[PDB]
């Protein structure tokens, strides 16, 4: 239930998230675009600096007034085919180099930590105060800097499928934000889009997002969601921890199958006032796919000895999730002390470096970094026994993959629905049906993906914001309005792209999208969006 | 009637040789006749079956069904075609084990060694 104090806690979390996103954007621009910095920063350094900045900023807010506050989502930097879960520690850089020596260079940016021109860099971070969570995620583009222009600018706009994915994600984000804002004043919903006297539904959300994705020739990655957020329940680990109640719309391989054939989440709800909504949309480009196929996810392991595929990425996930329902008294004193530190963090995913007493840095020092690494060695020693007794689990690294439909149809599964992954460590992904109508299990689909020679990895663009549907008493302006805690025109400004694809205006859904854009621009009689501003540091 | 003293008409020996033949011998044992079109085109009658050639079923309940060879399961003296399956309600698909003597090749997978084999059997390709 929205209140002045609850809204203020959400607002402060959103402000800290916006400031952190501006910080990472400035760091990346200085390292790769401005080039004032002598040595370019790497991805683990950027993640660590972002986390330290967030902790330093959050130290001053709600101190000695709130039991639990901290980082909700660790800083994740995903490049191209990687659709989530990439937050490596600083002590795994040489590990990554040694594990990926002799592989292809398709994941060279992730392996070396150094960004390259043409990269789609997706930055995700979240902040919670008293369990009230605000999460932001922005795709940006890395460009070569033109040496001839007096001012710094890209030589040319980004072109191709990555540009299509960025455009689709940005336009879907804006349209969904406007559509969810329309729930407060339902009469302003366009007639071509849906019923004037009726509200916003998950069916309308899904058909709008699918229409935008199909227009821009992109698929929706099966991790996308437009869901409701409560205290401590923000989907911070959605594929790992089951939830009692779910109110939102999700996209899966089952939904892709149903669209082709045209506590379980269902799109049979009505958006209500006084609610907080997370919108996380991942769009994968389908430019290189000459036929109709299915978009799925591939989990990255750290074992180089499982295959001979030179186009494989070998890495260890850096974010862990504590399972508070599991208890086991450990044998190592280091492991027991680490578990005591872990239980202080709460119910959000955490990095091993977040548990260091040296972290966050008061002054950025080489000695501070070295003491952090010295802590991290014993932290890994304790984490080995913690993970062995199922007290904590890894947050997976996932690569988007494309599997054609003809290979799936020609394949034979002798088990049907009965097959499942017995070696899987987590319950929720281990027993899953990605293709319920075809009777294909997750293990069977992974086997098909590995068996096909024409299964490729699709570039992904991501946009994720948090919004509040503020009622008239809740809002300052005496009218219902949408408060965007994260994202907007100041932090998530789109990069220079040029996409040949476009929305086709001769469709009712596209006309409703254009009218939603018009009514969002209309600041007099239309809808009211209040963006949350990043704060100044000096 | 046999005339060579090096060949045996013993049923026990023949059956043991068949059921203990190694993989390379089973390749020859698993031969399929060509279609009439391919027989006229290439000038040969039968070839050992391999993975990527298209076949027509001419015997059994699956007679008339066409498809591409999916596997040559030499361990069970059978071939598997992609389109010929047994289906269940739960979504299970079990390949039908077909014998190449009951199949007809309608399109050969042609490589260098396949062309050499056809020519040394007496082919007239192109």
């Amino acid at each position: 239930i929205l209140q002045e104090s609850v809204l203020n806690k959400y607002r402060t979390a959103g402000q800290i998230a916006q400031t952190a996103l501006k910080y990472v954007t400035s760091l990346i621009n200085d390292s790769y675009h401005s080039k004032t910095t002598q040595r370019q920063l790497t991805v683990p350094e950027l993640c660590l600096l972002t986390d330290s900045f967030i902790l330093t900023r959050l130290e001053q807010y709600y101190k000695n007034k709130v039991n639990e506050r901290g980082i909700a989502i660790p800083t994740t930097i995903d490049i191209d085919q990687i659709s989530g879960g990439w937050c490596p520690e600083i002590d795994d850089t040489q590990n990554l180099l040694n594990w990926n020596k002799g592989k292809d260079s398709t994941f060279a940016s992730s392996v070396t930590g150094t960004l390259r021109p043409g990269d789609l860099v997706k930055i995700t971070l979240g902040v919670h105060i008293d369990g009230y969570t605000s999460e932001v995620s922005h795709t940006m583009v890395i460009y070569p800097v033109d040496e001839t222009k007096p001012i710094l600018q890209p030589t040319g706009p980004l072109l191709g499928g990555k540009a299509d994915a960025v455009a689709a994600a940005h336009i879907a984000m804006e349209t969904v934000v406007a559509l969810l804002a329309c729930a407060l004043t339902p009469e302003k919903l366009p007639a071509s889009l849906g019923g004037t006297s009726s509200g916003i539904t998950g069916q309308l959300i899904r058909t709008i997002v699918d229409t935008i994705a199909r227009s821009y020739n992109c698929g929706v990655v099966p991790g996308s969601r437009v869901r409701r957020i409560r205290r401590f329940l923000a989907g911070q680990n959605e594929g790992i921890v089951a939830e009692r109640e779910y109110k939102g719309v999700v996209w899966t391989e089952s939904h892709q199958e149903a669209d082709l054939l045209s506590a379980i989440p269902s799109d049979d709800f009505v958006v209500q006032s006084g609610e907080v909504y997370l919108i996380d949309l991942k769009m994968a480009s389908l430019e290189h796919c000459t036929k109709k196929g299915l978009v799925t996810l591939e989990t990255v392991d750290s074992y180089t000895g499982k295959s001979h595929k030179a186009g494989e990425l070998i890495a260890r996930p850096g974010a862990y999730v504590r399972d508070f329902a599991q208890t086991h008294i450990l044998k190592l004193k280091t492991s027991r002390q680490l578990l005591t530190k872990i239980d202080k963090q709460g119910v959000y995913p955490f990095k091993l470096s977040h548990l260091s007493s040296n972290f966050p840095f008061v002054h950025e020092n080489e000695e501070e970094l070295q003491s952090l690494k010295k802590d991290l060695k014993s932290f890994r020693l304790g984490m080995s026994e913690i993970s062995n007794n199922y007290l904590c689990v890894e947050s997976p690294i996932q690569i988007a993959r494309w599997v054609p439909w003809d290979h799936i149809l020609k394949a034979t599964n002798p088990n049907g629905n009965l097959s499942y992954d017995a070696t899987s460590t987590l319950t929720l992904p281990g027993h899953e049906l990605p293709l319920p109508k075809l009777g294909v299990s997750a293990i069977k689909l992974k086997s098909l993906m590995n068996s096909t020679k024409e299964s490729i990895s699709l570039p992904v663009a991501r946009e994720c914001n948090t919004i509040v549907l503020c009622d008239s008493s809740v809002s300052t302006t005496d009218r219902p309005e949408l408060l965007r805690l994260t994202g907007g025109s100041k932090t998530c400004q789109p990069s220079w792209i040029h996409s040949q694809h476009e929305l086709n205006p001769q469709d009712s859904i596209v006309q409703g999208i254009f009218q939603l854009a018009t009514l969002a621009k209309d600041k007099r009689f239309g809808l009211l969006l209040k963006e949350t501003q990043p704060m100044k540091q000096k | 009637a046999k005339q060579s003293l090096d060949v045996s008409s013993d049923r026990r020996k023949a059956r043991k040789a068949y059921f203990t033949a190694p993989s390379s011998q089973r390749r020859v044992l698993l031969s399929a006749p060509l279609s009439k079109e391919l027989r006229a085109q290439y000038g040969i009658k039968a070839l050992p079956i391999r993975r990527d050639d298209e076949v027509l079923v001419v015997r059994g309940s699956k007679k008339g069904q066409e498809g591409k060879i999916s596997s040559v399961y030499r361990l069970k003296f059978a071939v598997q075609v992609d389109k010929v399956t047994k289906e269940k309600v739960n979504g299970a698909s079990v390949p039908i084990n077909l014998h190449p003597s009951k199949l007809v090749i309608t399109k050969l997978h042609l490589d260098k060694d396949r062309k050499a084999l056809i020519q040394r059997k007496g082919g007239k390709l192109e």
């Binding site: 954007t25 621009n29 600018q153 706009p157 336009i171 082709l260 149809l409 109508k437 220079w496 | -």
Partner: peptide, 26 residues
């Protein structure tokens, strides 16, 4: 067979522009 009918339907169903941003680094 319902699975066979589903597979047959699947086989049946499978058988200017836009510009964002500008010449600047946000």
């Amino acid at each position: 067979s319902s699975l066979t009918l589903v597979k047959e339907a699947l086989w049946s169903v499978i058988d200017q522009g836009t510009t964002l941003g500008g010449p600047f680094f946000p």
